[PDB]
């Protein structure tokens, strides 16, 4: 019941295969809107993203989809952990650089295992996130609605 399988590729940091699972507002048609390999082209401060997200909500013209990335093999998990640490240690989110036509933005959010879910994504509309979990990379997908 995964939505998408592909690469996350951040040059000179980590490249690995992951499955994306639904968390909130993430229909399976997202598979059509994600490339084979998500290219991480930048980093951005979380507060800047949350400010943007509340303007996005006010516009009524986008859908905010949250997915959970899972490494597919033990080798993938090693790189997944590198990339989590890259963003976590800098207090940054990743920014995708190669979005398909229907995707306005995609951000990569490191969610610590005991972290509280960043409040703009609450509440989830979908399976949500379990309380007991590893360190996670979430994908915040800003998709064209109308």
């Amino acid at each position: 019941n995964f939505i998408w399988k592909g690469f996350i590729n951040m040059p000179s940091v980590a490249k690995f295969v992951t499955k994306a699972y639904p968390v909130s507002g993430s229909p399976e048609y997202l598979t059509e809107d994600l490339p084979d390999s998500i290219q991480v082209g930048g980093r951005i401060s979380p507060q800047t993203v949350w400010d943007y997200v509340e303007k996005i909500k006010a516009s009524g013209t986008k859908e905010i989809c949250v997915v959970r990335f899972t490494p597919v093999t033990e080798e993938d998990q090693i790189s997944y952990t590198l990339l989590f640490a890259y963003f976590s240690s800098r207090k940054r989110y990743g920014v995708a650089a190669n979005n398909m036509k229907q995707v306005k933005d995609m951000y990569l959010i490191p969610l610590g295992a005991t972290d509280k879910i960043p409040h703009p994504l609450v509440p989830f509309d979908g399976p949500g996130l379990e309380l007991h979990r590893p360190n996670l990379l979430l994908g915040l997908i800003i998709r064209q609605k109308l």
Partner: peptide
Amino acid sequence: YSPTSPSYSPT
């Protein structure tokens, strides 16, 4: 009305 994506630092 369409908010512009915020700038970010490239890596």
